[PDB]
């Protein structure tokens, strides 16, 4: 059911944490939008923290979903899965061994995130073994005990290596877009 | 993966099969329909069957999939190769599951002798489940990888551990039976 939460959004994707909470990477958000999912901006509580943006709606947009745990990154060494959905209809889950949470500057943008190494390896070639432009917003998830946890959204990666970066939520964040 | 590559993955018996070329179809022996009189409209007497354990190749005498080019089929791949298992599910989902291949070996699975290659799924910490790993119904799915500018198929899905993190694809062998 995890895949059902990954939604196409703007130039990337977003993830439904619950019926009222949607997270995504700031960069991919549709520009000058008057509303989202039929809901007027004034009825949405937007939390924009750098490259991590969270939308909290007044009503249930995805009432078919249960509420998941959202945390600010994960312990270093955790092996997560980045749930990459493609317009081709392909669902591409990729294991990533997470590194440290750190402030970063990626192509002119300040990114509070966590780097990770794709298990497909540095020698891995092909879009089916790594992330590519258009994949931002994809969720980084993992299971702790009996609970599923989402700890970030895809923000960047090296062009020829196996290093990726997911933006992570922060306490401070703007209220507008 | 390219749309034409996915188009080669075909529902077959209790699983799937893969069109290597317009005249060659491969699958896992276990999923082959029982008591079949023909395949794709061709009577058995017109098909050259090569059944090598859990790997079966069908060669037809007319182009069944003329829209396709011929691909390279090899007996497994080098240990360490990262392949993608082209999994199709009944609801239209396409899941190219990454797998780091291990060694080729003669295995004994549920009493069956399976000449195959094991591999570690690279989808998550525990590929247990339908969203991250393989499940019953997926046998026959091709294990492929790109070498330079050529897509190569090196096996067909045959098994997985209970946790689901380790998988096995049946691989072709030079010797095989000519019957079902
Ligand atoms: C999603 C948004 C979009 O499509 O615009 C997209 C996903 C890219 C991917 N390949 O998964 N993100 C980007 O494109 C992002 C910009 C947005 C606005 C945040 N840029 C990157 O991810 C670029 C690669 C773009 C591309 N053509 O694929 N990556 C970097 O700049 C990378 C950042 C990084 C990655 C891992 C760890 C730390 C930092 N930096 C490098 O590749 C550097 C560049 C040279 C340098 O300054 O050192 N090179 C090396 C070897 O690290
Ligand atoms: C496709 C055909 C079908 O649907 O019947 C299907 C795909 C399974 C999947 N989940 O991807 N294949 C099978 O079901 C296949 C049929 C055999 C080849 C006749 N069997 C298995 O995949 C079983 C499923 C066990 C289960 N989940 O209950 N897997 C094994 O038997 C597994 C094979 C293996 C894989 C990797 C490395 C080594 C061995 N073996 C085990 O789990 C063994 C069994 C020991 C025993 O039989 O007593 N146990 C351990 C701990 O390794």
Tab-separated table of C-alpha atoms and ligand atoms in Angstrom:
chain	number	residue	atom	x	y	z
A	1	UNK	CA	0.000	0.000	0.000
A	2	UNK	CA	3.114	2.179	0.265
A	3	UNK	CA	3.045	2.755	-3.492
A	4	UNK	CA	-0.498	4.093	-3.302
A	5	UNK	CA	0.908	7.020	-1.301
A	6	UNK	CA	3.444	8.124	-3.932
A	7	UNK	CA	1.721	10.823	-5.981
A	8	UNK	CA	2.778	12.623	-9.161
A	9	UNK	CA	3.168	16.296	-8.275
A	10	UNK	CA	4.517	19.125	-10.417
A	11	UNK	CA	7.925	18.240	-11.864
A	12	UNK	CA	8.290	15.432	-9.356
A	13	UNK	CA	6.385	13.513	-6.694
A	14	UNK	CA	4.902	13.755	-3.226
A	15	UNK	CA	3.996	11.311	-0.469
A	16	UNK	CA	0.787	11.015	1.553
A	17	UNK	CA	1.831	10.534	5.171
A	18	UNK	CA	-1.833	10.446	6.191
A	19	UNK	CA	-5.263	11.475	4.849
A	20	UNK	CA	-4.397	15.118	5.549
A	21	UNK	CA	-0.610	15.283	5.335
A	22	UNK	CA	1.310	15.433	2.048
A	23	UNK	CA	5.095	15.895	1.843
A	24	UNK	CA	7.313	16.711	-1.125
A	25	UNK	CA	10.488	18.472	-2.209
A	26	UNK	CA	10.035	22.229	-2.450
A	27	UNK	CA	11.624	22.459	-5.909
A	28	UNK	CA	8.991	20.336	-7.663
A	29	UNK	CA	5.915	22.189	-6.394
A	30	UNK	CA	3.729	23.668	-9.180
A	31	UNK	CA	4.434	27.400	-9.453
A	32	UNK	CA	1.796	30.049	-8.726
A	33	UNK	CA	-0.812	27.461	-7.748
A	34	UNK	CA	-4.127	28.829	-6.481
A	35	UNK	CA	-5.008	25.474	-4.945
A	36	UNK	CA	-3.849	21.900	-4.376
A	37	UNK	CA	-5.996	18.795	-4.811
A	38	UNK	CA	-9.055	21.002	-5.193
A	39	UNK	CA	-8.341	22.746	-1.895
A	40	UNK	CA	-7.861	26.533	-1.648
A	41	UNK	CA	-4.512	27.721	-0.293
A	42	UNK	CA	-6.237	29.462	2.616
A	43	UNK	CA	-7.480	26.035	3.718
A	44	UNK	CA	-4.002	24.499	3.709
A	45	UNK	CA	-1.316	24.762	6.390
A	46	UNK	CA	1.945	24.858	4.437
A	47	UNK	CA	5.267	24.241	6.187
A	48	UNK	CA	8.195	25.040	3.899
A	49	UNK	CA	11.570	24.225	5.455
A	50	UNK	CA	14.225	24.627	2.795
A	51	UNK	CA	13.830	21.789	0.294
A	52	UNK	CA	11.277	19.972	2.458
A	53	UNK	CA	7.654	21.072	2.245
A	54	UNK	CA	4.692	19.702	4.167
A	55	UNK	CA	1.041	20.349	3.333
A	56	UNK	CA	-1.602	19.869	6.027
A	57	UNK	CA	-5.156	19.998	4.700
A	58	UNK	CA	-8.305	20.933	6.612
A	59	UNK	CA	-10.128	17.852	5.336
A	60	UNK	CA	-9.232	14.267	4.456
A	61	UNK	CA	-7.885	14.176	0.902
A	62	UNK	CA	-6.885	10.507	1.045
A	63	UNK	CA	-9.312	9.053	3.637
A	64	UNK	CA	-8.338	5.585	2.400
A	65	UNK	CA	-4.945	5.898	4.101
A	66	UNK	CA	-3.747	5.215	7.630
A	67	UNK	CA	-1.406	7.652	9.353
A	68	UNK	CA	2.308	6.902	9.067
A	69	UNK	CA	5.168	8.042	11.272
A	70	UNK	CA	7.162	10.969	9.889
A	71	UNK	CA	10.574	11.643	11.398
A	72	UNK	CA	13.431	14.050	10.703
A	73	UNK	CA	15.856	11.735	8.956
A	74	UNK	CA	16.953	8.412	10.422
A	75	UNK	CA	19.867	6.940	12.381
A	76	UNK	CA	23.081	6.749	10.379
A	77	UNK	CA	23.487	3.263	8.946
A	78	UNK	CA	19.759	2.661	8.506
A	79	UNK	CA	18.945	0.924	5.227
A	80	UNK	CA	15.953	2.704	3.726
A	81	UNK	CA	14.033	2.240	0.518
A	82	UNK	CA	13.497	5.137	-1.860
A	83	UNK	CA	10.134	4.490	-3.525
A	84	UNK	CA	10.684	5.749	-7.053
A	85	UNK	CA	7.577	5.885	-9.217
A	86	UNK	CA	8.069	6.698	-12.924
A	87	UNK	CA	5.635	8.045	-15.534
A	88	UNK	CA	6.246	4.797	-17.407
A	89	UNK	CA	4.234	3.028	-14.730
A	90	UNK	CA	7.354	1.462	-13.261
A	91	UNK	CA	7.624	1.172	-9.468
A	92	UNK	CA	11.315	1.183	-8.549
A	93	UNK	CA	12.208	0.529	-4.892
A	94	UNK	CA	15.909	1.050	-4.213
A	95	UNK	CA	17.759	0.242	-1.010
A	96	UNK	CA	19.916	3.065	0.359
A	97	UNK	CA	22.316	2.875	3.316
A	98	UNK	CA	21.879	6.246	5.011
A	99	UNK	CA	24.753	8.445	6.095
A	100	UNK	CA	24.771	11.574	8.233
A	101	UNK	CA	22.238	14.392	8.337
A	102	UNK	CA	23.888	17.603	7.166
A	103	UNK	CA	23.392	21.081	5.753
A	104	UNK	CA	24.206	21.131	2.054
A	105	UNK	CA	24.316	23.464	-0.916
A	106	UNK	CA	23.203	21.775	-4.113
A	107	UNK	CA	23.240	23.732	-7.360
A	108	UNK	CA	22.593	26.990	-5.534
A	109	UNK	CA	19.967	25.658	-3.139
A	110	UNK	CA	20.315	25.265	0.622
A	111	UNK	CA	19.346	21.706	1.477
A	112	UNK	CA	18.951	20.281	4.962
A	113	UNK	CA	19.197	16.584	4.232
A	114	UNK	CA	20.771	13.196	4.723
A	115	UNK	CA	23.062	11.521	2.213
A	116	UNK	CA	22.942	7.822	1.478
A	117	UNK	CA	24.564	5.178	-0.696
A	118	UNK	CA	22.452	3.171	-3.140
A	119	UNK	CA	23.118	-0.537	-2.692
A	120	UNK	CA	23.224	-0.874	-6.478
A	121	UNK	CA	26.778	0.428	-6.150
A	122	UNK	CA	28.992	3.090	-7.688
A	123	UNK	CA	29.507	1.024	-10.840
A	124	UNK	CA	25.729	0.845	-11.275
A	125	UNK	CA	24.603	2.309	-14.598
A	126	UNK	CA	21.087	2.894	-15.886
A	127	UNK	CA	18.022	4.742	-14.630
A	128	UNK	CA	16.670	1.450	-13.302
A	129	UNK	CA	19.468	1.264	-10.743
A	130	UNK	CA	19.504	4.862	-9.548
A	131	UNK	CA	17.645	8.163	-9.288
A	132	UNK	CA	17.418	10.751	-12.063
A	133	UNK	CA	15.988	14.242	-12.619
A	134	UNK	CA	12.212	13.979	-12.378
A	135	UNK	CA	12.424	11.624	-9.380
A	136	UNK	CA	12.487	14.296	-6.672
A	137	UNK	CA	9.853	14.003	-3.993
A	138	UNK	CA	10.148	10.204	-3.852
A	139	UNK	CA	9.924	8.972	-0.239
A	140	UNK	CA	12.685	7.399	1.834
A	141	UNK	CA	11.046	4.810	4.080
A	142	UNK	CA	11.950	1.971	6.410
A	143	UNK	CA	10.350	-0.301	8.981
A	144	UNK	CA	11.022	-0.097	12.707
A	145	UNK	CA	9.428	-2.940	14.649
A	146	UNK	CA	5.888	-3.081	13.260
A	147	UNK	CA	5.692	0.530	12.091
A	148	UNK	CA	6.573	2.062	8.742
A	149	UNK	CA	8.533	5.302	8.923
A	150	UNK	CA	9.043	7.955	6.250
A	151	UNK	CA	12.100	10.090	6.987
A	152	UNK	CA	12.736	12.157	3.868
A	153	UNK	CA	11.955	13.003	0.236
A	154	UNK	CA	14.372	12.665	-2.689
A	155	UNK	CA	16.279	15.852	-3.458
A	156	UNK	CA	19.538	15.035	-5.237
A	157	UNK	CA	22.229	12.599	-6.306
A	158	UNK	CA	25.686	12.479	-7.858
A	159	UNK	CA	25.641	12.033	-11.631
A	160	UNK	CA	28.023	9.057	-11.805
A	161	UNK	CA	28.187	7.720	-8.267
A	162	UNK	CA	25.728	5.957	-6.000
A	163	UNK	CA	25.234	8.827	-3.555
A	164	UNK	CA	21.766	10.297	-3.064
A	165	UNK	CA	20.303	12.946	-0.804
A	166	UNK	CA	16.868	13.175	0.752
A	167	UNK	CA	15.580	16.441	2.185
A	168	UNK	CA	14.531	16.105	5.816
A	169	UNK	CA	11.982	18.079	7.815
A	170	UNK	CA	13.013	20.755	10.304
A	171	UNK	CA	11.287	22.587	13.167
A	172	UNK	CA	11.591	25.965	11.442
A	173	UNK	CA	9.790	26.649	8.179
A	174	UNK	CA	7.865	29.291	6.249
A	175	UNK	CA	4.071	29.269	5.980
A	176	UNK	CA	3.821	30.316	2.331
A	177	UNK	CA	5.170	29.165	-1.034
B	1	UNK	CA	13.598	-0.135	-18.793
B	2	UNK	CA	12.424	0.410	-22.404
B	3	UNK	CA	8.751	-0.222	-23.267
B	4	UNK	CA	9.755	-2.779	-25.904
B	5	UNK	CA	11.736	-4.681	-23.269
B	6	UNK	CA	8.691	-4.820	-20.979
B	7	UNK	CA	6.513	-5.875	-23.936
B	8	UNK	CA	8.566	-9.078	-24.107
B	9	UNK	CA	7.381	-10.120	-20.629
B	10	UNK	CA	4.363	-12.331	-21.282
B	11	UNK	CA	1.709	-13.940	-19.084
B	12	UNK	CA	2.251	-17.694	-19.431
B	13	UNK	CA	0.726	-20.602	-17.532
B	14	UNK	CA	0.915	-19.925	-13.801
B	15	UNK	CA	3.610	-17.314	-14.300
B	16	UNK	CA	5.449	-15.469	-17.043
B	17	UNK	CA	7.759	-15.981	-19.977
B	18	UNK	CA	10.041	-13.758	-22.051
B	19	UNK	CA	10.415	-13.228	-25.803
B	20	UNK	CA	14.154	-13.265	-26.551
B	21	UNK	CA	13.424	-12.794	-30.254
B	22	UNK	CA	10.482	-13.111	-32.683
B	23	UNK	CA	10.884	-16.912	-32.515
B	24	UNK	CA	12.371	-17.671	-29.085
B	25	UNK	CA	10.412	-17.708	-25.821
B	26	UNK	CA	11.897	-18.669	-22.464
B	27	UNK	CA	10.258	-19.462	-19.145
B	28	UNK	CA	10.584	-21.355	-15.870
B	29	UNK	CA	9.623	-25.006	-16.368
B	30	UNK	CA	7.327	-25.056	-13.323
B	31	UNK	CA	4.842	-22.531	-14.776
B	32	UNK	CA	4.311	-24.244	-18.143
B	33	UNK	CA	0.623	-25.092	-18.788
B	34	UNK	CA	-0.140	-28.779	-18.334
B	35	UNK	CA	-1.758	-30.764	-21.155
B	36	UNK	CA	-1.272	-27.914	-23.638
B	37	UNK	CA	-1.757	-28.879	-27.295
B	38	UNK	CA	-0.236	-25.666	-28.620
B	39	UNK	CA	1.456	-22.427	-27.583
B	40	UNK	CA	0.707	-19.070	-29.219
B	41	UNK	CA	-1.302	-20.880	-31.882
B	42	UNK	CA	1.509	-23.270	-32.785
B	43	UNK	CA	0.930	-27.003	-32.312
B	44	UNK	CA	3.537	-28.775	-30.176
B	45	UNK	CA	4.783	-30.688	-33.226
B	46	UNK	CA	5.938	-27.375	-34.713
B	47	UNK	CA	7.882	-26.218	-31.652
B	48	UNK	CA	11.465	-27.096	-30.758
B	49	UNK	CA	11.463	-27.544	-26.987
B	50	UNK	CA	14.662	-27.303	-24.968
B	51	UNK	CA	13.904	-28.194	-21.355
B	52	UNK	CA	16.993	-27.981	-19.169
B	53	UNK	CA	15.793	-28.522	-15.622
B	54	UNK	CA	13.850	-25.467	-14.475
B	55	UNK	CA	14.762	-23.506	-17.601
B	56	UNK	CA	12.772	-24.086	-20.780
B	57	UNK	CA	13.243	-22.514	-24.190
B	58	UNK	CA	10.669	-22.697	-26.983
B	59	UNK	CA	11.748	-22.050	-30.572
B	60	UNK	CA	8.992	-21.500	-33.136
B	61	UNK	CA	9.246	-21.953	-36.905
B	62	UNK	CA	7.561	-18.666	-37.790
B	63	UNK	CA	7.863	-15.223	-36.235
B	64	UNK	CA	5.355	-14.955	-33.391
B	65	UNK	CA	6.606	-11.507	-32.302
B	66	UNK	CA	7.927	-9.971	-35.563
B	67	UNK	CA	7.957	-6.513	-33.940
B	68	UNK	CA	10.964	-7.549	-31.835
B	69	UNK	CA	14.698	-7.623	-32.469
B	70	UNK	CA	16.786	-10.521	-31.190
B	71	UNK	CA	18.394	-10.150	-27.767
B	72	UNK	CA	21.385	-11.844	-26.208
B	73	UNK	CA	20.563	-14.776	-23.925
B	74	UNK	CA	23.420	-16.057	-21.784
B	75	UNK	CA	23.800	-18.778	-19.155
B	76	UNK	CA	23.727	-16.599	-16.067
B	77	UNK	CA	26.005	-13.611	-15.554
B	78	UNK	CA	29.284	-12.800	-13.783
B	79	UNK	CA	29.030	-12.867	-10.004
B	80	UNK	CA	28.567	-9.292	-8.811
B	81	UNK	CA	26.479	-8.254	-11.799
B	82	UNK	CA	23.539	-6.045	-10.815
B	83	UNK	CA	20.455	-7.139	-12.739
B	84	UNK	CA	16.813	-6.086	-12.787
B	85	UNK	CA	14.064	-8.693	-12.535
B	86	UNK	CA	11.308	-7.457	-14.853
B	87	UNK	CA	8.291	-8.185	-12.688
B	88	UNK	CA	4.805	-7.670	-14.115
B	89	UNK	CA	1.837	-7.950	-11.737
B	90	UNK	CA	-1.769	-8.694	-12.696
B	91	UNK	CA	-2.892	-5.105	-12.079
B	92	UNK	CA	-0.626	-3.551	-14.696
B	93	UNK	CA	2.183	-2.719	-12.287
B	94	UNK	CA	5.759	-2.927	-13.559
B	95	UNK	CA	8.502	-3.518	-11.004
B	96	UNK	CA	12.133	-3.691	-12.190
B	97	UNK	CA	13.629	-5.148	-8.996
B	98	UNK	CA	17.367	-4.628	-8.612
B	99	UNK	CA	19.392	-7.683	-7.624
B	100	UNK	CA	23.110	-8.274	-7.049
B	101	UNK	CA	23.879	-11.673	-8.528
B	102	UNK	CA	25.832	-14.349	-6.716
B	103	UNK	CA	27.214	-17.665	-7.915
B	104	UNK	CA	25.675	-20.124	-10.356
B	105	UNK	CA	25.015	-23.502	-8.759
B	106	UNK	CA	22.974	-26.684	-8.780
B	107	UNK	CA	20.315	-26.249	-6.121
B	108	UNK	CA	17.589	-28.422	-4.630
B	109	UNK	CA	14.368	-26.480	-4.154
B	110	UNK	CA	11.197	-28.164	-2.923
B	111	UNK	CA	12.552	-31.420	-4.310
B	112	UNK	CA	13.332	-29.978	-7.731
B	113	UNK	CA	16.849	-29.815	-9.144
B	114	UNK	CA	17.367	-26.197	-10.140
B	115	UNK	CA	20.419	-25.100	-12.076
B	116	UNK	CA	20.380	-21.408	-11.292
B	117	UNK	CA	22.000	-18.328	-9.849
B	118	UNK	CA	21.144	-16.782	-6.497
B	119	UNK	CA	21.007	-13.047	-5.958
B	120	UNK	CA	20.386	-10.451	-3.272
B	121	UNK	CA	17.481	-8.061	-3.812
B	122	UNK	CA	18.527	-4.415	-3.452
B	123	UNK	CA	15.058	-2.983	-2.822
B	124	UNK	CA	15.177	-2.537	0.945
B	125	UNK	CA	16.404	-3.968	4.256
B	126	UNK	CA	13.908	-6.819	4.004
B	127	UNK	CA	12.317	-7.442	0.613
B	128	UNK	CA	9.605	-9.468	2.330
B	129	UNK	CA	6.278	-8.614	0.757
B	130	UNK	CA	4.637	-7.755	-2.541
B	131	UNK	CA	5.803	-4.139	-2.782
B	132	UNK	CA	9.501	-4.831	-2.315
B	133	UNK	CA	10.131	-8.407	-3.383
B	134	UNK	CA	8.997	-11.322	-5.514
B	135	UNK	CA	5.964	-13.483	-4.797
B	136	UNK	CA	4.365	-16.715	-5.985
B	137	UNK	CA	3.047	-15.921	-9.446
B	138	UNK	CA	6.229	-14.087	-10.471
B	139	UNK	CA	8.122	-17.129	-11.760
B	140	UNK	CA	9.245	-16.798	-15.348
B	141	UNK	CA	10.096	-13.099	-15.033
B	142	UNK	CA	13.397	-12.330	-16.804
B	143	UNK	CA	16.630	-11.263	-15.101
B	144	UNK	CA	18.251	-8.660	-17.374
B	145	UNK	CA	21.064	-6.123	-17.388
B	146	UNK	CA	22.615	-3.694	-19.833
B	147	UNK	CA	26.126	-4.304	-21.116
B	148	UNK	CA	27.372	-1.401	-23.214
B	149	UNK	CA	24.529	-0.855	-25.684
B	150	UNK	CA	23.018	-4.340	-25.461
B	151	UNK	CA	20.298	-5.582	-23.121
B	152	UNK	CA	21.152	-9.112	-21.978
B	153	UNK	CA	18.790	-11.686	-20.457
B	154	UNK	CA	20.489	-14.286	-18.258
B	155	UNK	CA	17.798	-16.176	-16.368
B	156	UNK	CA	14.126	-16.520	-15.411
B	157	UNK	CA	12.693	-16.178	-11.907
B	158	UNK	CA	12.398	-19.472	-10.039
B	159	UNK	CA	12.486	-18.991	-6.253
B	160	UNK	CA	13.085	-16.840	-3.182
B	161	UNK	CA	13.746	-17.309	0.522
B	162	UNK	CA	10.981	-16.870	3.093
B	163	UNK	CA	12.281	-13.425	4.066
B	164	UNK	CA	12.314	-12.765	0.348
B	165	UNK	CA	15.682	-10.997	0.283
B	166	UNK	CA	17.472	-13.778	-1.608
B	167	UNK	CA	16.149	-14.830	-5.015
B	168	UNK	CA	17.083	-17.469	-7.580
B	169	UNK	CA	16.766	-17.451	-11.352
B	170	UNK	CA	16.951	-20.630	-13.401
B	171	UNK	CA	19.703	-20.465	-16.016
B	172	UNK	CA	20.049	-22.148	-19.402
B	173	UNK	CA	22.275	-25.192	-19.858
B	174	UNK	CA	23.743	-26.707	-23.029
B	175	UNK	CA	21.887	-29.983	-22.421
B	176	UNK	CA	18.117	-30.317	-22.207
B	177	UNK	CA	15.120	-32.494	-23.061
B	178	UNK	CA	13.047	-32.041	-26.224
B	179	UNK	CA	9.700	-32.736	-24.554
B	180	UNK	CA	7.464	-31.147	-21.918
C	1	LIG	C1	15.166	16.160	-8.627
C	1	LIG	C2	14.719	17.586	-8.954
C	1	LIG	C3	14.971	17.917	-10.426
C	1	LIG	O1	14.751	17.011	-11.260
C	1	LIG	O2	15.383	19.068	-10.685
C	1	LIG	C4	16.644	15.961	-8.971
C	1	LIG	C5	17.085	14.508	-8.776
C	1	LIG	C6	18.488	14.321	-9.357
C	1	LIG	C7	18.943	12.860	-9.338
C	1	LIG	N1	19.867	12.485	-10.219
C	1	LIG	O3	18.390	12.019	-8.424
C	1	LIG	N2	17.519	16.864	-8.210
C	1	LIG	C8	18.362	17.658	-8.864
C	1	LIG	O4	18.456	17.675	-10.090
C	1	LIG	C9	19.257	18.559	-8.010
C	1	LIG	C10	18.810	20.015	-8.161
C	1	LIG	C11	17.471	20.230	-7.452
C	1	LIG	C12	16.918	21.626	-7.747
C	1	LIG	C13	17.624	20.023	-5.943
C	1	LIG	N3	20.615	18.415	-8.557
C	1	LIG	C14	21.281	17.271	-8.431
C	1	LIG	O5	20.853	16.294	-7.819
C	1	LIG	C15	22.674	17.236	-9.061
C	1	LIG	C16	22.655	16.248	-10.231
C	1	LIG	C17	21.622	16.641	-11.289
C	1	LIG	C18	21.540	15.584	-12.393
C	1	LIG	N4	21.784	16.035	-13.620
C	1	LIG	O6	21.261	14.414	-12.136
C	1	LIG	N5	23.589	16.725	-8.031
C	1	LIG	C19	24.515	17.472	-7.439
C	1	LIG	O7	24.727	18.658	-7.688
C	1	LIG	C20	25.328	16.721	-6.384
C	1	LIG	C21	24.740	17.034	-5.006
C	1	LIG	C22	25.187	16.012	-3.961
C	1	LIG	C23	24.942	14.660	-4.172
C	1	LIG	C24	25.305	13.727	-3.206
C	1	LIG	C25	25.914	14.149	-2.029
C	1	LIG	C26	26.161	15.500	-1.820
C	1	LIG	C27	25.799	16.433	-2.785
C	1	LIG	N6	26.725	17.170	-6.455
C	1	LIG	C28	27.572	16.643	-7.333
C	1	LIG	O8	27.274	15.748	-8.122
C	1	LIG	C29	28.987	17.224	-7.301
C	1	LIG	C30	29.032	18.453	-8.213
C	1	LIG	C31	30.402	19.134	-8.170
C	1	LIG	C32	30.700	19.677	-6.770
C	1	LIG	O9	30.210	20.789	-6.478
C	1	LIG	O10	31.410	18.968	-6.025
C	1	LIG	N7	29.924	16.209	-7.805
C	1	LIG	C33	30.358	15.211	-7.043
C	1	LIG	C34	31.237	14.269	-7.565
C	1	LIG	O11	29.937	15.106	-5.754
C	2	LIG	C1	7.254	-19.089	-8.637
C	2	LIG	C2	6.534	-20.407	-8.932
C	2	LIG	C3	5.321	-20.586	-8.018
C	2	LIG	O1	4.621	-19.575	-7.796
C	2	LIG	O2	5.128	-21.732	-7.555
C	2	LIG	C4	7.687	-19.031	-7.171
C	2	LIG	C5	8.271	-17.665	-6.807
C	2	LIG	C6	8.509	-17.604	-5.297
C	2	LIG	C7	8.872	-16.200	-4.806
C	2	LIG	N1	8.450	-15.835	-3.599
C	2	LIG	O3	9.613	-15.399	-5.617
C	2	LIG	N2	8.649	-20.103	-6.876
C	2	LIG	C8	8.401	-20.970	-5.899
C	2	LIG	O4	7.395	-20.931	-5.193
C	2	LIG	C9	9.468	-22.044	-5.679
C	2	LIG	C10	8.959	-23.368	-6.252
C	2	LIG	C11	10.050	-24.437	-6.165
C	2	LIG	C12	11.236	-24.066	-7.058
C	2	LIG	C13	9.486	-25.797	-6.581
C	2	LIG	N3	9.692	-22.173	-4.232
C	2	LIG	C14	10.168	-21.161	-3.512
C	2	LIG	O5	10.503	-20.075	-3.985
C	2	LIG	C15	10.329	-21.436	-2.017
C	2	LIG	C16	9.314	-20.605	-1.231
C	2	LIG	C17	9.445	-20.857	0.273
C	2	LIG	C18	8.373	-20.091	1.051
C	2	LIG	N4	8.342	-18.780	0.826
C	2	LIG	O6	7.609	-20.675	1.818
C	2	LIG	N5	11.694	-21.056	-1.628
C	2	LIG	C19	12.578	-21.974	-1.253
C	2	LIG	O7	12.327	-23.176	-1.174
C	2	LIG	C20	13.965	-21.441	-0.895
C	2	LIG	C21	14.849	-21.530	-2.141
C	2	LIG	C22	16.191	-20.822	-1.945
C	2	LIG	C23	16.336	-19.500	-2.350
C	2	LIG	C24	17.560	-18.858	-2.200
C	2	LIG	C25	18.637	-19.539	-1.644
C	2	LIG	C26	18.491	-20.861	-1.238
C	2	LIG	C27	17.267	-21.503	-1.387
C	2	LIG	N6	14.499	-22.323	0.152
C	2	LIG	C28	14.241	-22.121	1.441
C	2	LIG	O8	13.583	-21.176	1.875
C	2	LIG	C29	14.842	-23.173	2.373
C	2	LIG	C30	13.884	-24.367	2.376
C	2	LIG	C31	14.407	-25.534	3.216
C	2	LIG	C32	13.425	-26.705	3.152
C	2	LIG	O9	12.781	-26.848	2.090
C	2	LIG	O10	13.333	-27.426	4.169
C	2	LIG	N7	14.958	-22.629	3.734
C	2	LIG	C33	15.919	-21.769	4.059
C	2	LIG	C34	16.020	-21.292	5.360
C	2	LIG	O11	16.817	-21.374	3.117
